[model samples]
Target chain A: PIRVPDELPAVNFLREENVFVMTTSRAQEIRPLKVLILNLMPKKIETENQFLRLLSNSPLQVDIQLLRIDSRETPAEHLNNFYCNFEDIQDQNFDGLIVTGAPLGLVEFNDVAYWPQIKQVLEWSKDHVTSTLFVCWAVQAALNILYGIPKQTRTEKLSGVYEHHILHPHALLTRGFDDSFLAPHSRYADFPAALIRDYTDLEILAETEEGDAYLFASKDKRIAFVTGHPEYDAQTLAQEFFRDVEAGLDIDVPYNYFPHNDPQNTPRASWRSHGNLLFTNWLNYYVYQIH
Target chain B: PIRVPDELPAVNFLREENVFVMTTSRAEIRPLKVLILNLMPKKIETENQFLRLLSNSPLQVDIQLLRIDSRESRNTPAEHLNNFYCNFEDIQDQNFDGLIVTGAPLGLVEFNDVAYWPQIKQVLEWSKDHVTSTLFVCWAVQAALNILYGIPKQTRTEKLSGVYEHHILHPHALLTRGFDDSFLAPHSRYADFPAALIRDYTDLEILAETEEGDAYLFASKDKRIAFVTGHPEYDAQTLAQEFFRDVEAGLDIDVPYNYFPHNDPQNTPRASWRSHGNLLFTNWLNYYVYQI
Candidate 1:
């Protein structure tokens, strides 16, 4: 969206970044960008909207295709109406692919029902997808299989809003972000920063100052690996927290969530700006900038 | 840029704001025609701050410089202005997608005393018919309200000279989208805007206000026109420089509010507002200016 003169000194700073500017009035010949969403969350419809809000919030026309090689509590009507079969479009190319967090954070990869199909999609992404963003469970698993890294499980679920600090200031995904920012985390899986960096072509972009959650990206800038759910709404985490409480499972009040508005103390999502920047930057840097 | 099934409940939410939904494919992207009436003393620095904000977006913006023809150069080079700034005759007849009227360093001076007040009013009158949306900042807000909405400005006992936190009165507002629960902006003028009067007099919504009850952001129901009383586009060192300059000139000025690390000028004034500033500029350019 930046088109300033060559003589302008400020473009020098954003020259400065992948703050990517177009020089001329060369109107972009934009089309509906193809994005494939592999839904892994059980809360199907809301998850679709969550990703939809993040993707559609920008100015690009993204044509979304959902894959149901996925799901737990999703309605059959939604699955039949909105989802495309893997067999129907295995050869199709997508501008971007996003794999939502699956509830298999504690489940073994080989034992999972759709592990083989998930593996197939991950392998296929290298060839047919321009960029990919893997969230939570998929982040650790995607790294484990694709880069051949080690992963470990945590004792208790880290389910709440947590603060993360930017490790790479100029990385496109974390661009314009404050030094430390808050995001939603809900998983039992962990991808160690040392192992990811020591092993192969992965770079750690941002991590918690407490070292609990991490954000990673590929050397090719093809994917954004997020350990936390920046797309999570106030209710998204609250739903999970309350669900576990009802089931008599381990959980803590989401960290820094209760800045107490009323005595009833409702949780407010103060992380939308983080989500807003994260999605927009990924789309611009990975999907659009690649063109 | 994101399209989902119309049947999806999410589509209902995305359509709530222009910042979120533009479902069609308008493939021919044109550069937004933007203007800045450079009323600040250091013309180039002010240009950089505003331009930095505009550059953060994913749209192509075409920026031009404007002057009121008062024709004095205290902080910027005449060479730069002559080469870059457009004449009133050239652009008056043309249309623009966005226009920003910068805050003048005039403080509480009478409007007509600004040698080019007549020309400032002339350009402002031209702004309504020829521009898609106009953004007024700081002192410009008072000038625009007085001219367009018939409001008056008053003086202040203290120059509200520091960076203070402001609360977002309207979270879903297109101009203030992506802003944090509370944000910071610098206020350096000696004049006070009549927020009470603007509220009672016009249809403009008081979108944001300070913890101290000063109105910070205002917009019409259409979200196209806006008035911001604080400087969100300030550089990290802008307030510091202004403070030191005042001190150097023997002018009475306290340290910028909540700016320094310990309320001490020796500590570097880190910018706590850049993220919000960038978001506002991008939202204005994307949502209000171009969407209309």
Candidate 2:
């Protein structure tokens, strides 16, 4: 069982992800590692579970803290029960921080309601957390806020399980990884290669031809940026695809996702091994052994 | 360093597996005890590969090196063996969480003709009572099957020297926990273990098999024994080194499949098996040894 704060909003969602939450009755000898998740997705429960599933696989005990921005509108009950506003946790230090992707990919960074608060949290992460993982839109946001890199709009939404090549095999992040692997991507904007190349401090560790910068790391390895959703379940793309179709949006079936590229069939979770390895490597190399 | 005996000869070689051996100052309160019987000709290389995989996990594992008492090894220096390895007689009373019997180079010879057969049989029999789980690899698998189940090893016309895809029969087995739908493993042997004979035994469950009649993996029903016919611990160039060695000895051999690009000997071999190999060992340690 993984130790979380008093009332986690994603308990049921995590159970669905096969993550066991520890009971208060059970005692632990070691001090549990503290982790904070900045959940920005509209469906907060889903994002929390996705990260928790990966985090719970390790033997180390982890205590999770949920963080939310003051400007974003989530259910008041959820916020009151499980989340702590940025103002509350700004002074707190965490072993690890996960900044999840937001649904505002189409919106300009400055136009987003909580852009300032998100930037503040990103700045705080540099010193407060041992390591930080920025995913999808968070990747774009961190790169922009930290390095002044701009995100470019793609002609089409890059949503699918795409093949990726490992650029730095010996890097601790990609340890125990295959030479080539598959990762799921879902976004309408990307960090252009030209801007990324200019940042001498940033190192691109893994990428796909279609989605150029799938993963990159800072010089000190304290911050990692992943453009793809390695934490997405098999059915996540299916749900997103159907939701777009029902809303009458012009989107193609997620490429190389469903069996035979047919939307009617359920896609197999082929990237799970790589996903498990990625998170485990992060926890083991980036967080646990940092001391 | 995995906190093994200070004088163990394999410590330097095991360090080459990309694992940092812990210093005495950083020792754990309790470390998992594991015994490995190094049977391969290149004992140092085998030791390095196995330690590399075992140390990748977060678990603190303490390893003990064991050697057979019945036969003398000409390949490994006598001083190295005398200093590092203890005979089975020295460890018979001790209990081990895990035991690994490595593949020997005597696959082509009949089981009875091997000089170390009696000693190996004694060790295997003792492992049932002394060890929590035992893993038999390559020639060791053939020997265990022949002795325990009356199965015979059949000679192959050509040596199987390549990476072969294996089909996992039981996905939920602890041994193949994180394996992909199909995984690659290197096999270099002159004998084959028939799948027909494996299926005849009620206690032995076939976990995985290759297309070419190679029973790549299997486990006993009681979970005390696991047999793997291929070398998941082989370095990328291990097969290439063996191929060149065979060629120099005036024996015909083919380039390893799915290894070098275009089957060129000079081309660097890719390590596609390391991820799955690491997963296999970690799962075995976690599920079977740690019981978590």
Candidate 3:
């Protein structure tokens, strides 16, 4: 964002184009944007690195905090060194809250041990956070809890890098996005498209041709949900596939990932640029400049 | 690009990993100060395009518009220029984090023959001491090369006016950060800088080039100076407007390549270059100016 001179004639025209401009008076009180990431993934360290890589790409000064649901078991070393229980930050307000995906995608929401704690955190976010991002499994969980939408089980794991088209190009969340972008999805369950259609308050901002909603934001713009893992590293899918193979479970190579779908080839990072734009836009339009 | 809480365990580890981090105490007072020298014919349009790219990033850019007092402009309204722009003399005493010298319409003419060459050369010389990093665009690229490196420009029989594909020579260069394997940028110029001469300079690195020997991007070893030969900041209709204007003026000009579909001139132009353009400017602001 720029601080254009007050008398510059381009100010009004730029504002008409929906460009964000901060006046000198507003800029004087600038502070680091506080973003809390509730890490629910089993590999909490990997998730932290991936999210931090995306969040720190922009010039905005982000102050990050790690959170974990007390009910879920994590490595004691990690919890002691890097993370705080959700109860630790309950009294504080954050500019943004990122509820990451958990591995309990196949189980019922209530069946998950930490579902109650997650619900509490979700409820607390509404009042204490300026904006919240629910990613992948968390997206389905939030839709189920908030809008009464149900998740449908997939006959096969929907794992691959899929192309997503922007359904609403004007949304601030999709600002600076290309006409189409790719994201990685690894899940055995998905929010039913038909069920999502009934929620009039949720605006689907992006989707795939297969009728999967990739991104949707609430009408008030305070909450955003992404069904795909845009924060996935290039090797994340590969690692997961090999993990499944090692466990003697049926698995397929991630499609459109490795060159020619070869398991021997190293995957090129194709989605990283888009991932940077997505995180930067969300931080700028939703968290930092929302007020 | 993040401000880590001092003594947070991540700070030392992140710094070892080469992530950009500043403590909160140091980051609070610094703003990226940028200066723009408007040498284009349409001053407002140039300002809008550059500002649009500069503002898209999260960095707080404090822009100061500068104009050359040695030359008189006829395209822009006098009132707007007088109100928004300052002459080089007014800003000579100030230091800038970044300086952008825009392309002028006098690319074909000899650099010394241009009326404002003396003033521009003075400003260029001053920038070495006053600005942290300077970006020279299109015609300004030729001028800077001619003055600073003694490189000569060759005249082509036909003007290269269209979208051209560029190959990145150095993927790790900060100026081309986040760029795809290839990108399309608009070029409309009759003068070309010789690639051989650029490579001969040990201090200069050609970050990107086209198949036709067009140097799309160049940077110095220290990242103090950057030269871009293509119009990455151009609007989609810029080439079309130039083509129509030249035709009406009885000049021989071809329709821009890969611009309008079917060469019918009725179709809308595509914006395949905007993303690259945005990335280039933001990277410069973040890696070069902000660091300084």
Candidate 4:
């Protein structure tokens, strides 16, 4: 056996009895990664869990700063008042930015009146932030303005869960992804996969069988645009359905969501794998590793 | 707003960017969590990737170390010895311990005949050296006779490719983890799950499966043993590669993996859903943050 230095710190005999070791050689070093989330969802608390699940996966500790848009008043007014605004974070730069999908699809994005200021936030993120994640409606707007890709209105709302087939196998963003992944879409308008594939040199990360491109990323910006709510907790859609029912609106229940379409029955735990996969891979390979 | 002090250190702003705001409130303090491996191989590199993935999650950093058996080395020396390892360094005193069971089938009632000889080495490997429980193996029967009660045997290896279904109904451990998720498995095993489930009482944290027996669990001395050999990266042709080569050797191998259940090459891929895949990945995250 090689000799160990006697002058070195003594090992705990009890711990040694359990089989723990220490080496004189230094261990591998990992740097912490910071990420900021612009949570525009009306339910700030519910959204926090969604983002936190993704953020907590990196070797780098994620320091999250929640940003709220001042133009809108969410249901959680007290919580909103306490949260940070763009002005508070204007002087600060970030490693990554996440602009979550909002419930503002009824109004035209440019004419929504918060467009100019939100546009400024997007512009600031372009140069100041290392990477950005735009979800659903936010992705639509970001694509229209950032890369000149326009969104086309559909004849009817693509209002159910769908399966996304991996079109391009070698895309770095989709690494560790299987041949197929599932996504839930609740949108009135969608950009065609072929159209997104044709107009720009952007990488189409995931696409659904119903012909809508679910996710894409730009080469220039290191930004990934996911047009689906992968962060929807097991209860999110159920809660949405219940809310709409209480509001007296006619709605079709989300298909393939719950097992046997029964409310009391637990939904099949199918979505969580790809959800974790996307978030973890994004943190490990995309945000944390990026310079 | 909190008033800024004049001529403050530049490190403050840098720390704030990476979510290091806690540094301003107090002096930096953290415990070192180290994970040790008794390396066996379903996929040698994939195990490393699994460990690295778990440890890399979260801002609280961890120190990771890999241990190896001296006698039989199935993995290349370039990846094994030259990469990162300590042979003589006894790690029985560290904070956390993990024993990863690679696919090594050869065994004797006497532990000496095992490629990595010495029954004492088998018992003392992580026995007296670590603080917490060590992760034992799928083939743990041969290694520790009384410790991890695993029975070794031969079985048909053909139905083992593609993905298998798993359920994450457990509350503890970080591997079968995430806010709420599930995924795929690529398994090829003949041996039954360990019998230690009934034998070891207090120290066991059994993440039992309805189908696969005890999918993963922990044992005595606070050691966690996840007896599994499902490859996360079995490659597109990995099972095919293994089977075709075995077939060429005239070893009576089964038809390759990943083809449809119909046995026709034209059918779409039909691998079963994996519930533990994401949990395993998230557990890695927890391992890095809390245990390492």
lDDT of each: 0.77, 0.74, 0.79, 0.54
Q: RMSD of candidate 3 to the true fold?
A: 3.4
The best-first sequence of candidates by DockQ reads 1, 3, 4, 2
User: What local lDDT score does residue B167 receive in model 1, on the 0 to 100 scale?
Assistant: 80
Candidate 2 lDDT, tens digit per residue, B56-139?
556556677898853355665576567667888888899988899999889678877888789999998898899988989888
The TM-scores, one per candidate, come to: 0.92, 0.82, 0.88, 0.74
lDDT for model 2 comes to 0.74
Runs in model 1 deviating more than 4 A are A22-27, A70-73, A260-263, B16-27, B70-77, B247-254
Worst 10 residues of 1 chain A by lDDT: A21-30
- Per-prediction count of colliding residue pairs? 9, 2, 0, 52
**Order of quality (lDDT):** 3, 1, 2, 4
lDDT for residue A61 in candidate 2, whole number 0-100: 52
Per-chain TM-score, chain A, candidate 1:
0.91
* lDDT per residue (tens digit) for residues A4-46 in model 1: 6666565666566545655543435545678899988888877
What pairs collide in candidate 1? A1-B58, A1-B59, A1-B60, A13-A16, A14-A17, A56-B2, A60-B1, B162-B256, B162-B257
Identify the candidate with maximal DockQ. Answer: 1
Q: Write the per-residue lDDT of candidate 2 for residues A167-222, one digit (tens) a residue.
A: 87566677667788888889887666555777647788888865488777776768
Which is the winner by TM-score between candidate 2 and candidate 3?
A: 3
Q: Under CAPRI classification, how is model 1 graded? A: medium
Query: In model 2, which runs have C-alpha deviations exceeding 4 angstroms?
Result: A1-31, A70-84, A87-91, A192-194, B1-29, B69-77, B147-150, B154-158, B170-173, B191-197, B204-206, B211-214, B220-222
What lDDT is reached at residue B140 by model 1?
87
TM-score of chain A of each: 0.91, 0.85, 0.91, 0.82
Candidate 3 chain A, poorest ten consecutive residues by summed lDDT:
A22-31
